[PDB]
Amino acid sequence: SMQEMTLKLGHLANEQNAWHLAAVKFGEELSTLTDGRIAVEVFPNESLGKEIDLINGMQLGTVDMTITGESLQNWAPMAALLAVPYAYKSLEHMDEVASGEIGEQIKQQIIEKAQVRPIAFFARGPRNLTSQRPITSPADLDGMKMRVPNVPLFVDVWSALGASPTPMAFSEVFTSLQNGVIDGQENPLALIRSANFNEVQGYVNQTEHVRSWIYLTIAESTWAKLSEDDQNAVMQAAATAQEYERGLLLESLAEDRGYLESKGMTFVEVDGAAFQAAAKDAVLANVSEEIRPIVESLFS
Numbered sequence: 663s664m665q666e667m668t669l670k671l672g673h674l675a676n677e678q679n680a681w682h683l684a685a686v687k688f689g690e691e692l693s694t695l696t697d698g699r700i701a702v703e704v705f706p707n708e709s710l711g712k713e714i715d716l717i718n719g720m721q722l723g724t725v726d727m728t729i730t731g732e733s734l735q736n737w738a739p740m741a742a743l744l745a746v747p748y749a750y751k752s753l754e755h756m757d758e759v760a761s762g763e764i765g766e767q768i769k770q771q772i773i774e775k776a777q778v779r780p781i782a783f784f785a786r787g788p789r790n791l792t793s794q795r796p797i798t799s800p801a802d803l804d805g806m807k808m809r810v811p812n813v814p815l816f817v818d819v820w821s822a823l824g825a826s827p828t829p830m831a832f833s834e835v836f837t838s839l840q841n842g843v844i845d846g847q848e849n850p851l852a853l854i855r856s857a858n859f860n861e862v863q864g865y866v867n868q869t870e871h872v873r874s875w876i877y878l879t880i881a882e883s884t885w886a887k888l889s890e891d892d893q894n895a896v897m898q899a900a901a902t903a904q905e906y907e908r909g910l911l912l913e914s915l916a917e918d919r920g921y922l923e924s925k926g927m928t929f930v931e932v933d934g935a936a937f938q939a940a941a942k943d944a945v946l947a948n949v950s951e952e953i954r955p956i957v958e959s960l961f962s
């Protein structure tokens with residue numbers, strides 16, 4: 663019948679990735695719940711903009727929604743908790759933190775300081791280091807040029823480990839690897855697959871150095887314009903999408919390694935104790951005083 667608005671939702675994954683399917687599901691549910699009054703247009707592959715630019719757009723009023731997580735720490739320091747290296751043990755552990763009082767504090771700081779509102783969270787598989795030569799311990803890095811996202815803690819940690827990390831938008835990584843500007847990057851297997859990093863990297867080093875969650879978010883200025891009933895619909899759609907996305911994540915854990923191996927990637931076992939010890943030291947040396955007690959608790 664009537665269509666009152668169309669929310670633009672951007673993310674960095676491709677159309678087979680769990681996040682995309684979840685974003686589509688969110689849109690379907692929200693449309694149903696609002697009798698078509700609120701439509702969602704999904705923009706994959708950073709086609710709406712790079713992550714940092716979408717966050718700025720949400721603040722300025724030009725972007726409605728995105729999938730974003732620890733890059734929010736550039737505005738809300740507590741958001742670094744989404745992705746502390748070696749902190750979270752499992753999906754269940756992360757669900758507890760993200761859904762508990764610590765998670766509520768993180769949510770409120772993101773709203774206040776970044777002017778974006780998390781409405782759902784998606785747990786992720788572990789990040790792994792990819793490279794052109796095997797990397798079995800920190801000693802192997804030897805100044806290796808690598809990409810990290812726009813996440814200050816990741817710059818701190820990877821520098822301390824012995825690499826030379828440069829922050830870059832996700833959609834620029836493939837060409838940067840292809841052109842030899844950087845030699846490696848780090849991400850969960852689902853995103854290595856999504857971005858076809860198998861075409862420009864030889865090795866997946868199983869560092870498993872970060873287990874993290876990420877948020878589906880709506881601009882606080884968009885949220886503010888919605889009626890209470892429509893806010894409720896957004897939350898309900900988001901909850902449905904979250905349950906759906908978890909299933910897709912679990913499916914991907916069964917298949918993504920095999921797929922990447924079929925595309926020629928070699929998986930490398932690492933000296934986990936060495937990586938863990940060195941990374942935890944670097945985290946503690948660089949963590950904001952604001953979240954230090956929580957990190958010390960997680961590391962205990």
Ligand SMILES: O=C(O)[C@@H](O)[C@H](O)[C@H](O)[C@@H](O)CO
Pocket residue numbers: 674713730731732733734810811812813831832848849850853876
């Ligand atoms: O490497 C990336 O860019 C992605 O894994 C995510 O965007 C990253 O985890 C953070 O920027 C999420 O805010």
